[PDB]
Design a protein around this ligand. Structure first.
Ligand SMILES: *[C@@H]1O[C@H](CO)[C@@H](O[C@@H]2O[C@H](CO)[C@@H](O[C@@H]3O[C@H](CO[C@H]4O[C@H](CO)[C@@H](O)[C@H](O)[C@@H]4O)[C@@H](O)[C@H](O[C@H]4O[C@H](CO)[C@@H](O)[C@H](O)[C@@H]4O)[C@@H]3O[C@@H]3OC[C@@H](O)[C@H](O)[C@H]3O)[C@H](O)[C@H]2NC(C)=O)[C@H](O[C@@H]2O[C@@H](C)[C@@H](O)[C@@H](O)[C@@H]2O)[C@H]1NC(C)=O
Ligand SMILES: *[C@@H]1O[C@H](CO)[C@@H](O[C@@H]2O[C@H](CO)[C@@H](O[C@@H]3O[C@H](CO[C@H]4O[C@H](CO)[C@@H](O)[C@H](O)[C@@H]4O)[C@@H](O)[C@H](O[C@H]4O[C@H](CO)[C@@H](O)[C@H](O)[C@@H]4O)[C@@H]3O[C@@H]3OC[C@@H](O)[C@H](O)[C@H]3O)[C@H](O)[C@H]2NC(C)=O)[C@H](O[C@@H]2O[C@@H](C)[C@@H](O)[C@@H](O)[C@@H]2O)[C@H]1NC(C)=O
Ligand SMILES: *[C@@H]1O[C@H](CO)[C@@H](O[C@@H]2O[C@H](CO)[C@@H](O[C@@H]3O[C@H](CO)[C@@H](O)[C@H](O)[C@@H]3O[C@@H]3OC[C@@H](O)[C@H](O)[C@H]3O)[C@H](O)[C@H]2NC(C)=O)[C@H](O[C@@H]2O[C@@H](C)[C@@H](O)[C@@H](O)[C@@H]2O)[C@H]1NC(C)=O
Ligand SMILES: *[C@@H]1O[C@H](CO)[C@@H](O[C@@H]2O[C@H](CO)[C@@H](O[C@@H]3O[C@H](CO)[C@@H](O)[C@H](O)[C@@H]3O[C@@H]3OC[C@@H](O)[C@H](O)[C@H]3O)[C@H](O)[C@H]2NC(C)=O)[C@H](O[C@@H]2O[C@@H](C)[C@@H](O)[C@@H](O)[C@@H]2O)[C@H]1NC(C)=O
Ligand SMILES: *[C@@H]1O[C@H](CO)[C@@H](O[C@@H]2O[C@H](CO)[C@@H](O)[C@H](O)[C@H]2NC(C)=O)[C@H](O)[C@H]1NC(C)=O
Ligand SMILES: *[C@@H]1O[C@H](CO)[C@@H](O[C@@H]2O[C@H](CO)[C@@H](O)[C@H](O)[C@H]2NC(C)=O)[C@H](O)[C@H]1NC(C)=O
Ligand SMILES: *[C@@H]1O[C@H](CO)[C@@H](O[C@@H]2O[C@H](CO)[C@@H](O)[C@H](O)[C@H]2NC(C)=O)[C@H](O)[C@H]1NC(C)=O
Ligand SMILES: *[C@@H]1O[C@H](CO)[C@@H](O[C@@H]2O[C@H](CO)[C@@H](O)[C@H](O)[C@H]2NC(C)=O)[C@H](O)[C@H]1NC(C)=O
Ligand SMILES: *[C@@H]1O[C@H](CO)[C@@H](O)[C@H](O)[C@H]1NC(C)=O
Ligand SMILES: *[C@@H]1O[C@H](CO)[C@@H](O)[C@H](O)[C@H]1NC(C)=O
Ligand SMILES: *[C@@H]1O[C@H](CO)[C@@H](O)[C@H](O)[C@H]1NC(C)=O
Ligand SMILES: *[C@@H]1O[C@H](CO)[C@@H](O)[C@H](O)[C@H]1NC(C)=O
Ligand SMILES: *[C@@H]1O[C@H](CO)[C@@H](O)[C@H](O)[C@H]1NC(C)=O
Ligand SMILES: *[C@@H]1O[C@H](CO)[C@@H](O)[C@H](O)[C@H]1NC(C)=O
Ligand SMILES: *[C@@H]1O[C@H](CO)[C@@H](O)[C@H](O)[C@H]1NC(C)=O
Ligand SMILES: *[C@@H]1O[C@H](CO)[C@@H](O)[C@H](O)[C@H]1NC(C)=O
Ligand SMILES: *[C@@H]1O[C@H](CO)[C@@H](O)[C@H](O)[C@H]1NC(C)=O
Ligand SMILES: *[C@@H]1O[C@H](CO)[C@@H](O)[C@H](O)[C@H]1NC(C)=O
Ligand SMILES: *[C@@H]1O[C@H](CO)[C@@H](O)[C@H](O)[C@H]1NC(C)=O
Ligand SMILES: *[C@@H]1O[C@H](CO)[C@@H](O)[C@H](O)[C@H]1NC(C)=O
Ligand SMILES: [Zn+2]
Lengths: 499, 499
């Protein structure tokens, strides 16, 4: 019987008590990264995140940093590969920058050969080292040209361009890549990119944010989420129909959170937690497992929620071979009003829930996750048992899918110096306690989890944060980005994989 | 009678001997800047120069600098205005970033109100201070979206988009702006952007540069120059037909050089200098004054040179109210072969001329202009009498046009520290000696020169050079860009304008 601690101090950092041998022998352990965060702009066209970080530098981070050079993996990808090889990792998830291989967006405008070569070299190098690539087709870095031609995912013309892009990738890399993540965290772009304008492209209602160049926080997230689903379903249908000879699997990446009631005996708090589960997860998981949106969403959102045609509904339903789950933390939910007529209404208010990390009797959900310096009542706290609850939920509610944990990690302040940043014990506690609950759920609930990829390989540009927080397991000196040095967390992870 | 020195040491730095009173009372003296060099990416969409400097950082400059924040005139435009006010300057040439006011390129996709406000404030502030704005509609910063939709100026669809952009500007700013420069330095983009790939968008033949993503150095510069002329002619026709109530003037900006024979008694050197004059100036000036290309170009370039239709020819001919001339330096020309069948052939070889700063008997053309550290046989030297020869040439060869010198300046190394950079006497010599020859040509040849704008107002991002050279008359600390401090050159210029 497996016992896991939910509060500090954790003792699972000991690999005599927990290591890769606690899991099935085929279990994949690795790390993850994304193109915009690690590559640099060298050699590629521009994408909406280059646009956003430049047009609105105070949304790029408090240091106004961006992905211009970041850790320069365009030059030093071979160092990324030596860190993995040093961990004896069997999995690496990275993303192909659409901008690098089709700079002008539409495929008929020509492909960038030098870009295609960059990824062949990378894939060849990983596989030579016995590392399985999980490649994300789209990690938020849409070619700027498509956002300016028709406002990206706001328009249905994105579906065919995305499909021609994906086709180019399966054809070029599919012989070696056997695992494809179509779109990374479905929930993010529509809410942050089109609801609150905290992420690219930064659209939202004028009174939600007056910096926004355009938008409607009330209608656009629903129009964007819809197209993301059709786009995704159309790539999966292209994959399973035209590239089945490649013997790969392809699936979506869902940002998952667990929700607990703020007051676990107030029915209003209980209804708000069930509504969160539906607006956060079901919004995407419902179309993917059933071809339609959740009923609470259809009731609440009404005309602002697009309908799937019977053909579209059939294409989206069951459009995955597995699910990639990104899990970071859990929130307490309590009711909150949905003012549909206010000019500052957003799609996120439609859930009628307010989210916190402290419940009604003042209990904090777990240890600290991310210190907010501007406001401390905004601090984020994590909850190791959340990975247990989310996985058990997905098994029971969504037909026992094959699952890969594609991102799980914790940042530490960039303020810290080199000695302090290399001694990241708070990261060992985060990862070890989630790994202890992940092993327990695989064993007790028989969830079909087949892999785990820690975020991130090394320090890189963090969306909305610049270089002010660090997520890597290996250290990078911003004044000289050549070396990736294993921090304590990286040395711990190494001993975990090979005990 | 006016005597001007052509070699160091110059003595025209004395304002008792030369000052604004040497010129007609209406003569406009000022400074110039461009949007990409001074604004920063904050608040605007991305353009091809953001794309280029990011995709190919080693072409952005030896320091890999770019226009991300540069001197941040988006925030500190009011400091730009205090420097001008301190000079008692009557002219300021600046450019409107197409990306800032129409981020998505095509006007029907919506205009950026906050962007339009930025320039209203700027124009209101200049005019309140008695400074005449010369506004450039296009200073190389084409929206990235138009370059990715149809490869920018390579396609004729640019003509209508550029015309809808310009229409938006005359309508928004035309009530205050009475001087419009349509496209800045016609010769540059086609040769550097489409011939040698040293500038954005960076297209060129694979063997001219293997970094190029696409291109043809032999055909594309001619296709680009042609469209630049049609685009320009169509904006001028829109201006003179739809905004004549505004009582403004509009003209092109031509990068002018003077050419001298390498050997001034070898006929081959003399023919090469006359050919340079035609390929460098006549390429644009011929269509503008006659509606057709020079005959040496029609003979030499043959099928690769596009033809104007009779309607297009009529539209381009006489499509200016004045000319803006940018003059920097003069070159010696000698013959050089034109190998039309080599795979590394470029439109620039078609002139059959090799350019140098030292003639056949070893005489250097004038004082040093720009030290090339990688190769010193590449150093650039200036020639003050060149502004005299160019102006006299334009008067005689091109129907005595109304002229404004829209750029003239010299850089000093960014290597120099603050004390050395504020003591820029080499800049006083450059400007004073050109101003001495400009006054002489106005007086002796009666050229219709009505203004002079020194480049640049302050230190900014320099195309292909990063922040490694400084062109400003006012100093900017890259570690704190708030202040613009007048260097010696700026204090000299101040005393020149108001003796
Ligand atoms: C998994 O997918 C299933 C579909 O494949 C989901 O089941 C569907 O659920 C729909 C409800 O959301 C349901 O459609 C409704 O059907 C009502 C009756 O339709 C028939 O009979 C009518 C009766 O007079 C007749 O007029 C019709 O012509 C049909 O013959 C209909 O009245 C409903 O419309 C009203 O309400 C909806 C909001 O739900 C409004 O959009 C609409 O304007 C109107 O006010 C509704 O019809 C739908 O109306 C909108 C239109 O775009 C659709 O085409 C139309 O269908 C439908 O019958 C079933 N389908 C089947 C095959 O059972 C299933 O949902 C869950 O299960 C059902 C039983 C229900 O409890 C849902 O709330 C559940 O969530 C999906 N499962 C999950 C887990 O979500
Ligand atoms: C200012 O603009 C003027 C035009 O408004 C320029 O003058 C034009 O110059 C053209 C030469 O470049 C000239 O066109 C040529 O005309 C030849 C005769 O055409 C008529 O008579 C023919 C004789 O049999 C007959 O077949 C025709 O149908 C006409 O009736 C013609 O043979 C030439 O074509 C050959 O050479 C050209 C290269 O120059 C090739 O492109 C072509 O394939 C062919 O090999 C040529 O015709 C042109 O052919 C190409 C086609 O696209 C054009 O439509 C066609 O015109 C034209 O006659 C004059 N126009 C007038 C009204 O005089 C003027 O140029 C300068 O002055 C002329 C006299 C000449 O010396 C040029 O070299 C000068 O540069 C411009 N001024 C300046 C300063 O450039
Ligand atoms: C988690 O939620 C539960 C259920 O909502 C909370 O318990 C409820 O707390 C209410 C106070 O917010 C209690 O109602 C009050 O009852 C007193 C005594 O009769 C009355 O004087 C108050 O005015 C109020 O009455 C309500 O007024 C509004 C009317 O519309 C309504 O009809 C009345 O009920 C309520 O009885 C109580 N329910 C139960 C089942 O315990 C719980 O709140 C916490 O516990 C209660 C016992 C009390 O000590 C609260 O002060 C305390 O916060 C909540 N838990 C926490 C930690 O917030
Ligand atoms: C500026 O250009 C002028 C004209 O091109 C240069 O003068 C010419 O220089 C040529 C040498 O490059 C002279 O030709 C040579 O003549 C000698 C004596 O007879 C002969 O032995 C050589 O082989 C050569 O002859 C040519 O060979 C190739 C044949 O196809 C052709 O038919 C022959 O002419 C040429 O006579 C001379 N012309 C004139 C009008 O002076 C000038 O070059 C400089 O001045 C001359 C006088 C001489 O001292 C050169 O060495 C010197 O460079 C050139 N100026 C400079 C500074 O480069
Ligand atoms: C966002 O878009 C929605 C949909 O067009 C706008 O809501 C409509 O507003 C009009 C005018 O007030 C009403 O007549 C409709 O009844 C509303 N429709 C729905 C479906 O809600 C909304 O005003 C827009 N919001 C902003 C901030 O632009
Ligand atoms: C807030 O969270 C705490 C922690 O889970 C809840 O406290 C537990 O409540 C159960 C049931 O009452 C007790 O058996 C446990 O002993 C409690 N744990 C702790 C650490 O005290 C608490 O009930 C939650 N409060 C509300 C209002 O939901
Ligand atoms: C640039 O474009 C020109 C025009 O297409 C190419 O030149 C042609 O090349 C073909 C194939 O060799 C020949 O049959 C034609 O006679 C050429 N046309 C002309 C007008 O010169 C050229 O090869 C291209 N260059 C590169 C480097 O792409
Ligand atoms: C190179 O440039 C120099 C400088 O202009 C030329 O020298 C002048 O030539 C004329 C005519 O021979 C003389 O009267 C001047 O006295 C010369 N000036 C100097 C400073 O010596 C020279 O002729 C040019 N050489 C060639 C081959 O073109
Ligand atoms: C790995 O962990 C298991 C418990 O799951 C333990 O029994 C085993 O001895 C550990 N292996 C090493 C090499 O420490
Ligand atoms: C951030 O920049 C935007 C301009 O895009 C501006 O509207 C906003 O006030 C800035 N925020 C702060 C807190 O300075
Ligand atoms: C890497 O992992 C494999 C598989 O568990 C193991 O056999 C091997 O010894 C490990 N190598 C290192 C250097 O730890
Ligand atoms: C599969 O590829 C073929 C050949 O290019 C094409 O006709 C077909 O539409 C594709 N099928 C899809 C995308 O389902
Ligand atoms: C606008 O929205 C904010 C945050 O959602 C809220 O504080 C404010 O009261 C809203 N304004 C109105 C008029 O409802
Ligand atoms: C940058 O880091 C690498 C790896 O530590 C080192 O070899 C190189 O010399 C460093 N460069 C400088 C300028 O110190
Ligand atoms: C300005 O220059 C002229 C010569 O062009 C000279 O005569 C005049 O005295 C100068 N003015 C001043 C104020 O020095
Ligand atoms: C400049 O960068 C390009 C990549 O875009 C590369 O091909 C070239 O070799 C680099 N030049 C030098 C001198 O390093
Ligand atoms: C600015 O120039 C005008 C016009 O020549 C002159 O009258 C005025 O005194 C000058 N002001 C300053 C402060 O030099
Ligand atoms: C002038 O503006 C009118 C009204 O928009 C339009 O019909 C016409 O085509 C324009 N004329 C030009 C661009 O010459
Ligand atoms: C290619 O062009 C360069 C510079 O224009 C020249 O040095 C070289 O000889 C050319 N190659 C061939 C094969 O002509
Ligand atoms: C930046 O420069 C301005 C102008 O000199 C100055 O007032 C401000 O205090 C400076 N900022 C810092 C951080 O020194
Ligand atoms: Zn940048």
């Amino acid at each position: 019987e497996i016992t896991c601690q939910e509060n500090l101090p954790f003792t699972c950092g000991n690999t005599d008590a927990l290591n890769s041998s606690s899991f099935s022998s085929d279990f994949i352990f690795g790390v993850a990264s994304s193109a915009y965060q690690i590559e640099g702009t060298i050699g590629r066209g521009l994408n909406i995140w280059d646009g956003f970080t430049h047009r609105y530098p105070n949304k790029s981070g408090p240091d106004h940093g961006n992905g211009d050079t970041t850790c320069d993996s365009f030059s030093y990808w071979q160092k990324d590969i030596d860190v993995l090889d040093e961990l004896n990792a069997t999995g690496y998830r990275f993303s192909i920058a659409w901008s690098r291989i089709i700079p002008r967006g539409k495929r008929s405008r020509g492909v960038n050969e030098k870009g295609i070569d960059y990824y062949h070299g990378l894939i060849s190098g990983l596989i030579k080292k016995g590392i399985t690539p999980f490649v994300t087709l789209f990690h938020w870095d849409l070619p700027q040209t498509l956002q300016d031609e028709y406002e990206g995912f706001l328009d249905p013309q994105i579906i065919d361009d995305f499909k021609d892009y994906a086709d180019l990738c399966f054809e070029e890399f599919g012989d070696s890549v056997k695992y494809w993540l179509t779109i990374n965290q479905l929930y993010s772009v529509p809410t942050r990119g089109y609801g609150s304008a905290l992420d690219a492209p930064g659209r939202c209602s004028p009174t939600v944010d007056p910096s926004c160049y355009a938008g409607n926080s009330s209608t656009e997230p629903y129009i964007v989420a819809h197209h993301q689903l059709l786009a995704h379903a159309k790539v999966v249908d292209l994959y399973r129909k035209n590239y089945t000879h490649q013997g790969g699997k392809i699936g979506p990446t869902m940002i998952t959170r667990w929700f607990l009631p703020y007051n676990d005996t107030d029915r209003h708090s209980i209804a708000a937690t069930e509504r969160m589960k539906e607006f956060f997860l079901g919004w995407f998981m419902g179309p993917l497992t059933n071809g339609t949106y959740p009923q609470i969403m259809i009731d609440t959102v009404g005309e602002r929620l697009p309908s799937f045609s019977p053909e579209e509904s059939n294409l989206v339903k069951g459009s995955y071979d597995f699910l990639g789950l990104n899990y970071y933390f859990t929130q307490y939910a309590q009711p909150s009003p949905n003012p549909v007529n206010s000019t500052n209404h957003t799609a996120m208010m439609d859930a009628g829930a307010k989210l916190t990390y402290i419940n009604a009797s003042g209990h904090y959900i777990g240890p600290l996750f991310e210190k907010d310096k501007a406001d401390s009542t905004d601090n984020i706290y994590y909850y190791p048992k959340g990975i247990y609850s989310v996985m058990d939920y997905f098994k029971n509610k969504y037909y026992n899918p094959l699952i890969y944990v594609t991102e799980n990690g914790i940042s530490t302040p960039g303020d810290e110096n080199r000695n302090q940043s290399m001694l990241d014990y708070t990261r060992i506690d985060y990862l070890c306690s989630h790994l202890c609950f992940l092993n327990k759920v695989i064993k007790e609930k028989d969830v079909n989890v087949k892999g785990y990829l820690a975020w991130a390989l090394g320090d890189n540009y963090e969306f909305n944060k610049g270089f002010t927080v660090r997520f890597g397991l290996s250290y990078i000196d911003w004044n000289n980005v050549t070396d990736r040095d294993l921090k304590k967390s990286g040395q711990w992870y190494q001993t975990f994989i090979s005990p």
